[model samples]
Target chain A: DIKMTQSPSSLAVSVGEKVSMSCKSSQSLLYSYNQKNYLAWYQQAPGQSPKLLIYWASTRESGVPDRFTGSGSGTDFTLTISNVKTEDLAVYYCQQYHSHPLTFGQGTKVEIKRTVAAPSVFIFPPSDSQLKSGTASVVCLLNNFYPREAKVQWKVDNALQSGNSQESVTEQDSKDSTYSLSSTLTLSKADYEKHKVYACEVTHQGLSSPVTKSFNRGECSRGGLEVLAQ
Target chain B: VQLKQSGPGLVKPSQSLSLTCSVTGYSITSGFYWTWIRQFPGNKVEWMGYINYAGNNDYNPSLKDRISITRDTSKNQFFLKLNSVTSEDTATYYCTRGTGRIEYWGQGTSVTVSSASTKGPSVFPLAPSSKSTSGGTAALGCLVKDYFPEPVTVSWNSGALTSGVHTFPAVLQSSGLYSLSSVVTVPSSSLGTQTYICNVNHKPSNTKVDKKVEPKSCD
Candidate 1:
């Protein structure tokens, strides 16, 4: 049986708020079926049924825009939107069609709006000490000058659902719009097994989907080791 | 559109028979195709093949060498051909479309294999679960393997009832000479005792056989 789920549930993105969606599968369906991942991504506008966007995991389906891309495999996968557009206001879902009882994730809906340029990216620090420990802190710095204004957001999977955020801007002399954004994710070693995701999204009025990157805390573990010491 | 499937209900392991799927209501226009699919007991479905409404066809490679699909728009029906047969091929066959995901499915027909009349190992797997409404109409059909030179009775029986329910001989269509269909309308509460069976007593071989089916309420 296959199961899938999405996070953030829903987000309100300004005209330029970067957006991202994720999909996680319950089991691995990586068998070589014609050399493809057997997974696909789809988008559903407010009133329309879901339409295929990405198929075989990463390959874009016919008529799909380049701004929508699928990446990753196994139990984890990500769909990134590069530059949010008013037309891109819809829910995105991922599905696995390789086996019976085909499954699809709930989905994430993006709300579009107009807002001033906010120069910051949400950051989440690593939680696993076995891979890397202690209070984790990181920064998101955006480059490339645009139409003088772009808004980015910082969100957390915090219980409070707090909009804890910070804003920064680049020098005016910089030919391109530049900004640095940062946030800290504090977790004890035990938090590693919670299986939460922290992501940074950059939204721009000129794009359809948001250009976003994500970092997972327990991502760096090596394969299980054996004991031959005896 | 009304689509009806026709074929023998039981075939000996080494014998071959043909099943036909006929459609009416809308003409077999362009963009439409007639297809056949099968399902095992309590399992996922499998697509067998399809013949375009115009008569062109494509079969699953796994069954390609042994199967053939043909269509006749004039008669508004399609057909399935099996060369050498086995118990593995025994399944509830259905005919649908090739264009969309199966939004329509035929009330499936059953195929059983036994040793009373043929060559090779006869493996009879579990019959596919019957699908029917609890308090509605139930219908069943049966066909003789080869000794078609026989008369058959489609009836219903229960452990409590000694004789049987209403029985009838099948009507012959363009596909092949076959037995009639028997239908019973019963309430959901009484289905447990209402087991429908199609019994065929072949003439030449004097072989007597039947398939028992219980009413299946919608889940």
Candidate 2:
């Protein structure tokens, strides 16, 4: 059975705003036999059973509103809702029907947001065990952002390094309905040793300015440390 | 249209699990598939099988051999029989009306399978928790544990929010027992001095767990 995890556990969006959430499976949901992705999306209102939204990764279920779109394949998938409405306030879940013991993501709750808050950013340096493997991973954790959407980029030595950067699904905080995100950048031993600086830049609609957190190569040590920034 | 199901809530391992779904406001001979879906103790939901008005049937390959979906048109009902049951087969089984996408559902019936018959679920009300996004919406979770024979059904009273109740499919523990949880959300104003009930019905044991909760204002 494949395990499914969804990000931005909850989101607060205004009416007419666009919302995008993701579901990641432990293994690829694409079946080589049929060349089809067995992933599906469901919408469950507060007092109702789940309604099927999208199936086969991208195909909409019969009578599902057109605004709900599903994309991506294999292990990573996305469900995007355009022009959200009051009727859209519900918890969205992703399910995999390709195999037995069919599983679902924990679910992402979408509700109305009166205010948007910028995320608190932090950088986590690579641990000694990761560095000993001849590769290092620098992680950026974004906390308490509203609207549940954001973009993250990585730079090495002040040069953009698009490759090897993996962003997590937006995760929602159940208590406050805020959103959090994380991204990781993997570097080869040579690049880790030579690069003088590594930075993560986050862009969010709620922010007046993008937040940037940097880690100096000189600070890399056996245990990881957190460098916090606005 | 509604589907009311009846059957043994408990079955011994290696024996067959049987249940009947009787329909109302519609005839069994009408065009539509009467389907059987089950949720295991965790988050797994499986489409077990279906029997159409014409008496034809289809089943999920995972349980194809041991599963039988049949209809008794004269009684305006449909039947489900799965043989050679095990602890993992324990689940809250639901009968639904539809061809593919289910349009209506029956109040689920929980079936547990074990070697020895024991007590029903230990049902209790959890602390009321509030979600900030839904203003004044208090969410109540009900925990049902230490049940034997697999499945257990938990429900709320007074239209006490049924949807969004997060109950996993039944999970069999090392001792061949089962445990499950469910949650419901209502406006906080509705909770003051109001007694909300969490009802657990285990048909096989002829037992019921009715735990009442009177939630207070969120601090």
Candidate 3:
């Protein structure tokens, strides 16, 4: 019978981070018979039945998300998680069904790391003459942050502003379970000209320092067109 | 090799299940691998994991982080602990040692993880409490009643000839549990003074209850 071995007995991970682990077998797991590796992956959540995640080394079982992927073949293989979530805080195992008496790799425990990570912050300035006509507005978007609870503030020329600005809602991505928020700050024509700089600051439990995004007032009226923000 | 197990037959939902598999007629360090497997209702099977001779290990990923398999080499016993158990984990667990294609197995331990439903049979050991006529002769009966999940094995231990022993399948009683009877009839007319033994093993619950009593004369 073939022997299977796995690495990293445990892992500490934060939400939305990508993680990967490896499994090695004593011999080639690739069975030339059907041009497939006889390998499978499993996830045993705390107190739940161990579920089949991937089989044939790469093909995912029905209902499993694309975030979980199994790759490699023969003597070495890997399971990569594109985005980790709170529910992923369990053990993972890899088994090779190539030979008699199937072998499993040592379990890899994915623990919740509680690590602090800053969100990717961005600001979208006003785009058109329509903005100069009515209330000019700029949006502050926060993406890929953890703990959900956060603080958002708007600033005009480094001065705090409360002029009809609101972050109406915060959302969690169904794909990776990360919290995101979009805040819009509205200003009158006079206010836009008065303030050369509009900025948004976000503070989250996962961040030791605040994340801030700034937009120059001149760009809001440039060419009267909208372009993608890099 | 002989494998026997010791563990809790019952547990509350969300609790952990810890068990031990005692090994004999073999040495764990000698060779081969030790593994754990389970069978659920409808005869579904799951191969959990195993420990090699050098104490290295592998496992089924489905239960990756929730389970721990270890051993005490000095006492020759391997262990399993599965935490945060739920109703889906309710099943019979088995321990096996093998180098190729599962060679030895422990008498399975029935683990009941639930909020309800565990009825143990009312056992009366060593008592032939009932006498009924089985066609041509008087019969002695060892009664096992009010059991659940329905699988029991019964046998008679006595000086009397084996031709007189008869066992019945579990019958559903009015109370929704089960009842079963094992009888001794058509024995030698002149019986010995030794007592008869009724060995009843409860499969689903893992209880071995045996009854014994002296036989009554045919007259």
Q: Ten residues in a row with the worst lDDT in model 3 chain A?
A: A221-230
TM-score of every model? 0.32, 0.47, 0.42
CA lDDT of each prediction against the hidden true structure = 0.51, 0.71, 0.67
Clash pairs (backbone) in predicted model 3 = A42-B61, A43-B61, A44-B62, A44-B63, A47-B84, A50-B62, A51-B62, A91-B65, B126-B211, B126-B212
Q: lDDT tens digits, residues A1-230, model 3?
A: 56677777777677789999998899998878788988888786643445678888998878889999999989989999978887886578787777755666767877665534455555555534324455465656555566556788998888897746655333333334455555656666776778777778888877778977676766432211223332
What candidate 3 gets wrong by more than 4 Å, as runs, is A1-230, B116-120, B123-139, B147-155, B158-178, B188-219
Give candidate 2 regions above 4 Å deviation: A1-17, A21-41, A44-48, A54-78, A83-230, B41-44, B121-204, B208-219
What DockQ values do the models have? 0.01, 0.04, 0.01
Per-residue lDDT tens digits of candidate 2, residues B139-168?
A: 555556557764566777744656534444
- DockQ-based class of model 2: incorrect
Cα lDDT of model 3 by residue, B166-202, tens digit: 4544555445666655545433332344456777777
What is the Cα-based lDDT of residue B71 in candidate 1? Answer: 71
Candidate 2, residue A75: lDDT = 91
- Candidate 1's DockQ is 0.01
- How much is A43 displaced in model 2, in angstroms? 2.7
